[PDB]
Structure formats: structure tokens, C-alpha cells
Amino acid sequence: MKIAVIGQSLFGQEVYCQLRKEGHEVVGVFTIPDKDGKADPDGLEAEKDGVPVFKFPRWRARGQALPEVVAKYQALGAELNVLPFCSQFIPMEVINAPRHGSIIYHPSLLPRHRGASAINWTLIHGDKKGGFTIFWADDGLDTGDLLLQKECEVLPDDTVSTLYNRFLFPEGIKGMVQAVRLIAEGTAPRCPQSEEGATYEGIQKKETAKINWDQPAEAIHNWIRGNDKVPGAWTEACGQKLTFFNSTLNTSGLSTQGEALPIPGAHRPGVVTKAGLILFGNDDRMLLVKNIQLEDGKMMPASQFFK
């Protein structure tokens, strides 16, 4: 098949590579402009292979597609668009252009967690089950007909990073590859999303990652791990934003010795122990944060906050 790849990241790069190794013709790659003199890895790769690469700063002016970009895209003769991860809205003149349309990767079980921080919200809400979806793009936001889906059990201490690294990245790549395989054979499913169980949530940035201490320890644990690594759950204390990593609720047999650490808002201060930083919910149950990062960027085991 003739394929246009529109992304972004390392994920996008691996997807691109796997489609190539599968015998598909990557007819063009549409990626982001160089920032800070750094090249996006997907763009770099295709450039090395001699595939047409485009680095459009924008796709539209005044709500409609740029005649330039539509012309350059149109000339490739793509029969499928593959969108592994490109955070912005490609114009519908591009989306619908190919005979097989466009397919998008999404790291949640649609229609749950529509939006851009779907992994985060999986974890913040304590979902027992997580997953990823490949879907046919339509003019809505993560609303298009499902193609394939794949689930995984969420582990109690899973973070955004672990869940991503151990399932959502590797299996999502295989999922996107299979989806293309199915489209090539004519066996690709189409399953419209129902409004049952359908949610949307906004992006998690550092700004929206502040800990609410008025919550059971579990929810606080889920909030930290659901922001764990990016963007990093935090609270103001000791004159600064304190960011927490590597939370657990398994405090069984752990000592509550050592130096107290005051936290405006928290039910109980919380102690820096030799196993990390004990923290308390509004139900006075404990969690353990193993790693802190200080506002000035210093990373540490929570055990040595007072060094």
C-alpha cells in the first residue's frame, strides 16, 4: 500500500519503520518543524531513507487548509493516512483524501478517555483496565469508528511511563501495523463508538497537576502515578513546588520514623523515612513516595530530603 505517515515522535518513527519492513510504500512523511535545532526522530529517519518529508509550521490559515500544503499532500497518491501521534488537527481535505481514509492511534479504550492525556486519566481515575485503540478518523475529536482495540490490566503501582513503556508503546506499534495489514487485505473492521461510557478530559500540564490533599490516600496515589513522569504531581512546601515520583500504597511493615515534612493542605505532615516519604489522605491512610524533585531541578530519593 501507498501510505502517508503524519506524526511526531519515536512512536511515529517505529510505526513508520515497521510499515516499511512490512513492504508498504511510505509515500510521504508529515512531521513537525525542527525546534531548538533538533530534528524530530520520525522526520530524520524518513529523510535518511530518501522519502519525501514535510515540516509544515501550520496546516491552516483562518480555519481552512493552506492551498500549498493540500497541493503538496495531494501529489503523493496516498491510499491510507497513518497518524500515530500528531497532537493537532490535520484538515479534513487531507483526512478524507485517500481511498482508505486515515487511521489514528489512541492510548485508551475508546470511547473512554477521549482527549490528549488519555494515559494520565486512565491512572488518575484508577481504571482497573487500560488499553489502546486504532480508529478511523472523522471530523470529531477521538469520535471516529473503532478499527481495533487492545487491553491490559492496570497494575496497582503503574505510572504513565511504565504503562506506556511496557504495553502502550510496544503493543500500540504492533496494533497500528496489524490495522494496516487488515486494510490491505480488506478485512478491517469498522465499529461506531457508542455514547455509553464515553468521556472526554483536558490535557495534563504541570499547571493542572497540583495535588488535592482532600482525598483518600488511594486517590492521591492514583493522582501522583497518573502524572508520573510527565508532567509530575506536585505541592507547595519548603518554599517551592515539590514534585513526587514512584508512589505506592504498600506501606505494610514500613516504619514512620524520621523527620516530619510540613505540607500546607495535607491532613497530616508526612515523614521523611529511610524508605521514602510517607503521605496521608483525608482518611488518614498512608502512601509512600520514593522520589522527589525540587523546583530547581534536583532529583533525589525521597529518603534524603534532609540529606
Swiss-Prot record:
Site positions (Essential for catalytic activity): D142
Active site: H106
Modified residues (Phosphoserine): S9
Binding site for (6R)-10-formyltetrahydrofolate: Q88, F89, I90, D142
Region (Hydrolase domain): 1-307
Family the UniProt entry places it in: In the N-terminal section; belongs to the GART family. In the C-terminal section; belongs to the aldehyde dehydrogenase family. ALDH1L subfamily.
Function summary: Cytosolic 10-formyltetrahydrofolate dehydrogenase that catalyzes the NADP(+)-dependent conversion of 10-formyltetrahydrofolate to tetrahydrofolate and carbon dioxide. May also have an NADP(+)-dependent aldehyde dehydrogenase activity towards formaldehyde, acetaldehyde, propionaldehyde, and benzaldehyde.
Protein name as it appears in the record: Cytosolic 10-formyltetrahydrofolate dehydrogenase
Full protein: residues contained: 1 to 307 of 902
